[PDB]
Amino acid sequence: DKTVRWCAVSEHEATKCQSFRDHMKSVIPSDGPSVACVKKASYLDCIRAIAANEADAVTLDAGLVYDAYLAPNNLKPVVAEFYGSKEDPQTFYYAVAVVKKDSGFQMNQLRGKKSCHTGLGRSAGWNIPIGLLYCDLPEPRKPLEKAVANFFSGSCAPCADGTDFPQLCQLCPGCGCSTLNQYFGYSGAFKCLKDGAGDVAFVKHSTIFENLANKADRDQYELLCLDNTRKPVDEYKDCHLAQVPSHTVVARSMGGKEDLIWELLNQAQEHFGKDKSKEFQLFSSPHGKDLLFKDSAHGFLKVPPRMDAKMYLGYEYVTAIRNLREGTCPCKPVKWCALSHHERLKCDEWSVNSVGKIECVSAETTEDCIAKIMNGEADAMSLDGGFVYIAGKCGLVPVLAENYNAGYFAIAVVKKSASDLTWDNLKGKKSCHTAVGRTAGWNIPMGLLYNKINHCRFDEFFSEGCAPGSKKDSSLCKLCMGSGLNLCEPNNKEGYYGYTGAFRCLVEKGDVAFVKHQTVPQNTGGKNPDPWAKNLNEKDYELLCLDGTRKPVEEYANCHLARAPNHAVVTRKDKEACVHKILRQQQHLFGSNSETKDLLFRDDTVCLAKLHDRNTYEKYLGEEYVKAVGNLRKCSTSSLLEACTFRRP
Ligand SMILES: O=C(O)CN(CC(=O)O)CC(=O)O
Ligand SMILES: O=C(O)CN(CC(=O)O)CC(=O)O
Ligand SMILES: [Fe+3]
Ligand code: NA
Ligand SMILES: [Ru+3]
Ligand SMILES: [Ru+3]
Ligand SMILES: [Ru+3]
Ligand SMILES: [Ru+3]
Numbered sequence: 001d002k003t004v005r006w007c008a009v010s011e012h013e014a015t016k017c018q019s020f021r022d023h024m025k026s027v028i029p030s031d032g033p034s035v036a037c038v039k040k041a042s043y044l045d046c047i048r049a050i051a052a053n054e055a056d057a058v059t060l061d062a063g064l065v066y067d068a069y070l071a072p073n074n075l076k077p078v079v080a081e082f083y084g085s086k087e088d089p090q091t092f093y094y095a096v097a098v099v100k101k102d103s104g105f106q107m108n109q110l111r112g113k114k115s116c117h118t119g120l121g122r123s124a125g126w127n128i129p130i131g132l133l134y135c136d137l138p139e140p141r142k143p144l145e146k147a148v149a150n151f152f153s154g155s156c157a158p159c160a161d162g163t164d165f166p167q168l169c170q171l172c173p174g175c176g177c178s179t180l181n182q183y184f185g186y187s188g189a190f191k192c193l194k195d196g197a198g199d200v201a202f203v204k205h206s207t208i209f210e211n212l213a214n215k216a217d218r219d220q221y222e223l224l225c226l227d228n229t230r231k232p233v234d235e236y237k238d239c240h241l242a243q244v245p246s247h248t249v250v251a252r253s254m255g256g257k258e259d260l261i262w263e264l265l266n267q268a269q270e271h272f273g274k275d276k277s278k279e280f281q282l283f284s285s286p287h288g289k290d291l292l293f294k295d296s297a298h299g300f301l302k303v304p305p306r307m308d309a310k311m312y313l314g315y316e317y318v319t320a321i322r323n324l325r326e327g328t329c330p331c332k333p334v335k336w337c338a339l340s341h342h343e344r345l346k347c348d349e350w351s352v353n354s355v356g357k358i359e360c361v362s363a364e365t366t367e368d369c370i371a372k373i374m375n376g377e378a379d380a381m382s383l384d385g386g387f388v389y390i391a392g393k394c395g396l397v398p399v400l401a402e403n404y405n406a407g408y409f410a411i412a413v414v415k416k417s418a419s420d421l422t423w424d425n426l427k428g429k430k431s432c433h434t435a436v437g438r439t440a441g442w443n444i445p446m447g448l449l450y451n452k453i454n455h456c457r458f459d460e461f462f463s464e465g466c467a468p469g470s471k472k473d474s475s476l477c478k479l480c481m482g483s484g485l486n487l488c489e490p491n492n493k494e495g496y497y498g499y500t501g502a503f504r505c506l507v508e509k510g511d512v513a514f515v516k517h518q519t520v521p522q523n524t525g526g527k528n529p530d531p532w533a534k535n536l537n538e539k540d541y542e543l544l545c546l547d548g549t550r551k552p553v554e555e556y557a558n559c560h561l562a563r564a565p566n567h568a569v570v571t572r573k574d575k576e577a578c579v580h581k582i583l584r585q586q587q588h589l590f591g592s593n594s595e596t597k598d599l600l601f602r603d604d605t606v607c608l609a610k611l612h613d614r615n616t617y618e619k620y621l622g623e624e625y626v627k628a629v630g631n632l633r634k635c636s637t638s639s640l641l642e643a644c645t646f647r648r649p
Pocket of ligand 6: 271
């Protein structure tokens with residue numbers, strides 16, 4: 001049977017679950033999902049029941065989503081409650097630190113300041129800010145209130161033990177835990193900042209806009225970002241302490257039943273959701289408050305399947321809570337992420353030769369690696385510009401570029417015999433790409449071509465081709481050479497994958513190859529001993545220039561599609577400085593003074609350059625590059641990008 005066993009934590013919740021059960025039976029057909037109702041004493045008892053295969057689903061706040069993730073529960077987010085309009089679904093809130101403009105201090109200078117909290121034990125007002133500050137607090141850190149009382153000079157921390165720690169209630173004597181206290185709650189803590197009582201208020205992004213209508217007033221405030229800078233209040237998305245999901249349905253990581261859970265809930269909102277006015281209303285609690293779901297919910301969004309709990313909660317939230325739960329405080333080694341059995345081996349060699357300054361983490365895919373850098377399991381890796389885009393939108397930034405001598409050149413290579421082909425009209429021809437979503441083989445050439453055909457349905461523009469990463473049924477997988485499941489994969493087991501592979505695809509099957517300016521020189525004239533390249537001459541090939549003409553291969557400077565941004569090392573913002581130093585020190589020892597091919601870094605890289613000003617993916621890639629990728633995103637199929645675009649569009 002297709003049964004979703006929902007877990008309730010109270011008799012009122014269980015009664016609603018039963019009404020939920022009986023009404024869905026009148027709406028869902030025989031082959032569809034039905035609900036069962038398991039009543040337990042608490043949210044943690046529900047988490048344990050789900051993990052024990054005695055129930056299937058429960059909706060949790062962020063704190064318990066974290067608890068549900070830890071072993072041995074290992075639950076996962078599947079469906080997201082959303083609020084507000086259908087056009088702009090508000091799935092998360094942002095915990096921010098608001099300050100007065102020109103007060104002259106950053107997040108890392110809060111010791112001694114006066115703080116305004118919404119209330120002790122609340123998320124944005126306490127657990128998150130104190131969670132992040134935890135190791136900055138003085139020892140002993142237990143009890144936590146004593147440590148905070150000895151960190152801020154004074155504060156208003158409603159519901160704090162002012163008798164034993166009167167510093168915490170200096171700004172609100174008694175620290176009344178009710179609205180009788182002027183500085184209690186979300187309006188109160190911001191009022192505690194506005195009135196001049198405190199120097200910082202830990203609140204939600206929307207508190208400022210709800211308590212100050214005129215933007216002129218809002219300009220007198222700023223936000224403290226975790227990189228120790230400030231930003232205006234309406235840039236909370238790029239300057240917050242944490243992005244927190246409001247209410248989240250969780251299920252087992254393996255054993256589900258994510259498929260049924262979404263079918264059940266999506267059906268339920270379509271017939272009993274907001275503005276549906278039936279006997280049974282999914283988001284009403286006739287004899288309670290927020291039973292099973294929050295009464296203010298407007299519907300449900302499916303959580304993208306690539307996303308786990310650490311990625312859904314976010315790096316900084318996980319850091320804050322882990323500090324509160326465990327209470328553990330210490331440049332540290334840089335954990336590099338390797339993708340192959342050949343790449344890991346190089347990493348282990350590199351690790352022992354670094355006297356411990358480099359450690360090694362592994363994963364199957366680049367996206368898996370990028371996810372491990374986001375959550376802290378890994379620290380750094382080198383990426384093609386196309387993956388830097390993914391990494392940037394996922395939160396990471398570039399810290400070092402690999403220089404090869406401004407970046408490398410992207411060109412279109414054809415066979416010289418074929419005198420007919422031009423850049424003007426390539427429709428109906430056979431294309432060879434390094435892979436989908438890569439700088440030289442896709443983002444640059446297909447970005448330009450998008451502007452000339454007005455769509456990204458490129459399998460209907462070219463007759464066929466090989467663009468590793470495309471869907472296996474696509475005409476852009478027909479020319480690939482991989483065998484079995486390897487066919488058309490964007491990895492080594494597909495022989496037409498990469499710069500060289502795409503050129504090989506041209507030699508043997510295709511009409512045009514989109515690669516970089518050195519690819520042809522390195523695979524002709526005997527440079528590449530493989531049979532497919534051994535006897536090739538670089539004079540039998542030429543490049544397609546944008547004006548519509550063709551030029552020889554070694555004249556790439558005058559005949560090129562666009563300058564491609566170099567590959568770059570990406571990391572988290574909180575480890576940018578440390579990766580920048582250890583690697584600049586590492587190439588000084590092992591630089592210009594790989595067993596297989598392009599392990600960790602490309603093999604034609606001389607050094608690792610600094611960027612200074614270009615420490616974000618938009619600054620590094622360029623404006624025109626980012627807009628091209630935006631146009632190509634309409635037809636793109638990246639699941640990692642889908643997940644971290646669910647948090648940050
Ligand atoms: O919240 C509660 O537990 C009390 N109930 C009364 C009851 O048990 O029916 C709320 C109400 O129904 O108004
Ligand atoms: O390559 C250069 O140095 C200048 N480019 C612009 C560019 O590469 O985007 C001229 C051109 O490509 O037509
Ligand atoms: Fe590249
Ligand atoms: Na919390
Ligand atoms: Ru009751
Ligand atoms: Ru119907
Ligand atoms: Ru009743
Ligand atoms: Ru150019």
